[PDB]
Design a protein around this nucleic acid. Structure first.
Ligand SMILES: [Mg+2]
Ligand SMILES: [Mg+2]
Ligand SMILES: [Mg+2]
Ligand SMILES: [Mg+2]
Ligand SMILES: [Mg+2]
Lengths: 114, 148, 59, 52
RNA sequence: GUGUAGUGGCGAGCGAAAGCGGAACAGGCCAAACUUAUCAUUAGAUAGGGGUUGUAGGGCUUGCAAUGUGGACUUGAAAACGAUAGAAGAAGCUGUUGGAAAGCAGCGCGCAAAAGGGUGAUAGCCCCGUAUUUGAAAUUGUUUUCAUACCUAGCGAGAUCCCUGAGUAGCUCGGAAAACGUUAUUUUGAGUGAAUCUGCCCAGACCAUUGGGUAAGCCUAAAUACUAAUUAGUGACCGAUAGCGAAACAGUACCGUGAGGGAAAGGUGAAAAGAACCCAGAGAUGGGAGUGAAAUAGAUUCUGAAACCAUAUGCCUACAACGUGUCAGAGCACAUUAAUGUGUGAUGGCGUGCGUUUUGAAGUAUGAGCCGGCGAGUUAUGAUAGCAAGCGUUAGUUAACCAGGAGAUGGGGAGCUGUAGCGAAAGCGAGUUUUAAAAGAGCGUUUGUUUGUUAUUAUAGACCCGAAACGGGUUGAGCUAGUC
RNA sequence: AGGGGUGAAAUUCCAAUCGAAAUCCGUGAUAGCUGGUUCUCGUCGAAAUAGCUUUAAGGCUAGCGUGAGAUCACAAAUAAG
RNA sequence: UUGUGGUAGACGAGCGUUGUAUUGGAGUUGAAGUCAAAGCGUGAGCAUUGGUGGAUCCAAUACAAGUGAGAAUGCCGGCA
RNA sequence: AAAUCCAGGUACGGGUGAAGACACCCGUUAGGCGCAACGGGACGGAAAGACCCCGUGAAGCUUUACUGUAGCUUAAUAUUG
């Protein structure tokens, strides 16, 4: 018994090529390059799915530092004024968003002054 | 039993296909290692081989075959530890052919052997009887005739 | 699968495995060895379990 | 299944692709568990009981 | 039997003969004694008779019983069964989609035929066949019958009678076949060389005893091996990069001085109804027409991917350092296998490919231009191990072979393993070897078998590809070297 | 006419090839040496040392991995004395 | 409750392909194959609709293998 | 037409790095795209390094290396008195 099987190979390569669309040049045409680029893209996806929560926290810190620097104290002093006194688990983003709807944030920053 | 669905209990085991990729394991190297003599086609040198070092068989001295060129003369043997389970009296070739232990087309001499005590009397007609086997058979108030 | 001829003449096989063998250093030089060594080596002995695999399939 | 292998019967059922007639000594395990309906003749029982 | 006894730089390796179960089965005839006829009968020759061997036979002298089986076989006659062309060979209409129905559906029907091929799409009943029943002037095959030649037949008695295969068997020198690396047995290139039933040879050097067989002359069907060929047919075989190298005008075209090497490619449609005619054009051709179910079936002819080359809606891009993507994210344009949607993606953060081999490669180490296809741990026969199954404590189990649907299976116990080991061996025996030792120690004082499947392994090329080479047979001195 | 030929000698020439032609066959030569060896998920997870080797780029055994099974307390670990 | 990085490498469970067997069944009211799409799965992989195409094919359980390609300065064809 | 070619949108300095970088790090410079030129580089291309080494690899050649041998020569024996 002889088995040729050109169906399965083409279907597999078609899936790999379909994965990489919107790629420059031949990367979406030739399969040999498409597989390399899909592998590399998924590596980058795995690394960035961690780097982005590494970075968004930093952005929230930055936009909280800026808001507090216009009241007379720094972010590195505000965190004490949440943990030790008036123990609060308000998150590190929402205290950021509260500036985009301000004058409810000022209530926070003057509440810890007690 | 419905050939349309015929099933066993368990016989279909992991078939190690050696060269069909990595996901199954056993892939490109195929279990042959990396780049040795065994890796190449037809590795696995001569069965007894220590690679130049004089092998165990060559190192050891040879057993002597005293009765050279002959074959040991076989015996048909009647042990007493089992012959009790066989139910028969007047043991001989003429009945051992019937009880299928011996064969009719066998001109072979008969020996008796074994220490185990036996209850009922049996009359043996054999070519050799041990000292204590003969003693055991006679303590059962049987007899043994030693054919010449 | 033919039995290795130069083996079946050196390893008599007993009941329940336990390949049997003679000892070396008994053919050539008497004086260089001692009496204790000579009468220890006359008695035959078994094969180390390391070589048991190499020999069992060699018979 | 038949013991004496009658000839009027097998003259029929030969043009029928479904059915088939066999002497007792010519039925196999596959040929029997494929039947899905069979007609045993009263004689072969005496034979069959002997063969177990 | 057994991978045994043996043989082997006792290494690699090699490997019988008996015995046993089976397929098939047949044993005949000369030379020589003696006799006949004839050869200048110097026959020591020519043609006859006779005779064929081992519990020895035959010839020589003398009697009895024989008319017959038997074939390894000559001619005729008759008959049967085949081979080579062929003859007959049952059974159906209606409706719907439909280009065409043989489908699908309704109601029937025939069968020793529901094997197969065709018919506008998948037919038991449209056709051609098949099952079955049949038939040969001529040529040929196998068998049988009757006659017909040639060959072939049996039990005794007597007696120093004669014959019973000569440069032969042996012995020696060098070699070999046989399982044996030279050894009984068997053969022989050289040399020598016997005996004659009270004999000769043989039973692993050799002699005696016992026992077996009679060389040195010929012939022999059957079982066995193989199939380019003829016929019928099959395939868990290939289906145009396969399968024979070859589906076609293939050993062609082509390469070579020559031996020799040696390819690729098939499909309109059911049927040519092969596309009259018109326009453009020099014309091929193209665009309408026309046939047709479809002309995106049009002779580039089944389907028609990818790499690749062009066109186009939508979005972005001409201060920008880029393994070219990813995570965020605006604006823009659309609207779905209804989804916290789709395409592009100004701009931020981040980011030195894949296999290979290597201590370690982004690699200034190597492989791949790109796409598609082809392409690399299988098979036979045995070994051990794991798992599962059948069968079981005088267990288990068949091989070859025979019958069978190119079947499961039934017969077939010859053998295989296990049932008592130990010992180099005779031997002994739940004991046994060593030993003076019955102490001591070694080894033993029961846990089976046959298959299935899987892993590993052995001999075969044994995962695949890869040498330079080695040997054997042939073709070449039309260039060049020499000679004529 | 090729384990040959020819050579005013160079290892020249022998059909664009000659330290021993060309093609066919044994033949699928052998290669401890390069290169290649094609589907997935899960569990576990090393060595790059010792001895010997006409051996040192290879091989055998031990060491180290894994699977199946037993030992389950006196065995193996981890701290103090 | 203790865990779940991993080459060589051991072990386990699995997807797919081609065909055979029986069992169901779809098909000119358009089968496979082929492209396209804004689906479903833990993966090998699997559906749905439409255009093309114009006759075979799908699922369930066993069975058998020329059974699974990105690399061999791989072979053949095509194309840059 | 060709050899070449992992995909490419293919800067420079200092440093680092399998030790000499288009890509990495930190600075610096640079609108997009051709044409004629020249050759510094991309350890450019063509050749599985000719040297060297390794393989229990090959061939050719040598010799008071080994084992054998065609030839040449010597003796017994047959041809044979
Ligand atoms: Mg490799
Ligand atoms: Mg003798
Ligand atoms: Mg790979
Ligand atoms: Mg290079
Ligand atoms: Mg270069």
């Amino acid at each position: 018994m002889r088995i040729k099987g050109g169906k399965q190979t083409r279907v597999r390569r078609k899936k790999w090529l379909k994965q990489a669309s919107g790629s420059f040049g031949t990367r979406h045409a030739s399969y040999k390059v498409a597989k390399q680029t899909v592998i590399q893209a998924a590596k980058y996806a795995y690394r960035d799915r961690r780097n982005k929560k590494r970075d968004f926290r930093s952005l929230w810190i930055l936009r909280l530092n800026a808001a507090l620097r216009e009241q007379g104290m720094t972010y590195s002093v505000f965190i004490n004024l949440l943990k030790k006194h008036n123990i609060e688990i308000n998150r590190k983003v929402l205290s950021e968003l509260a500036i985009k709807e301000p004058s409810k944030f000022n209530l926070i920053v003057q509440k810890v002054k007690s | 039993l419905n050939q349309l669905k015929s099933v066993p209990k368990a016989r279909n085991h992991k078939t190690k296909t050696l060269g069909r990729g990595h996901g199954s394991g056993l892939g490109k190297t195929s279990g042959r290692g990396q780049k040795g003599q065994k890796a190449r086609k037809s590795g696995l040198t001569r069965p007894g081989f220590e690679g130049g070092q004089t092998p165990l068989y060559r190192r050891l001295p040879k057993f002597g075959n005293a009765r050279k060129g002959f074959l040991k003369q076989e015996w048909v043997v009647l042990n007493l530890n089992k012959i009790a389970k066989l139910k028969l009296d007047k043991i001989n070739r003429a009945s051992l052919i019937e009880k299928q232990v011996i064969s009719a087309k066998s001109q072979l001499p008969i020996k008796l052997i074994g220490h185990t005590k036996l209850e009922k009397p049996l009359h043996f007609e054999v070519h050799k009887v041990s000292k204590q086997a003969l003693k055991a058979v006679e303590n059962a108030n049987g007899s043994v005739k030693l054919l010449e | 699968m033919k039995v290795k001829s130069a083996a079946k003449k050196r390893f008599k096989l007993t009941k329940s495995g336990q390949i049997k063998r003679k000892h070396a250093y008994t053919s050539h030089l008497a004086p260089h060895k001692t009496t204790k060594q000579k009468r220890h080596l006359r008695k035959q002995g078994t094969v180390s379990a390391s070589d048991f695999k190499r020999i069992g399939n060699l018979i | 299944v038949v013991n004496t292998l009658n000839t009027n019967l097998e003259q029929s059922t030969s043009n029928i692709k479904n059915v088939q007639v066999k002497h007792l000594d010519k039925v196999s395990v596959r040929d029997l568990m494929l039947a899905n309906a069979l007609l045993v003749e009263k004689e072969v029982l005496k034979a069959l009981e002997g063969k177990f």
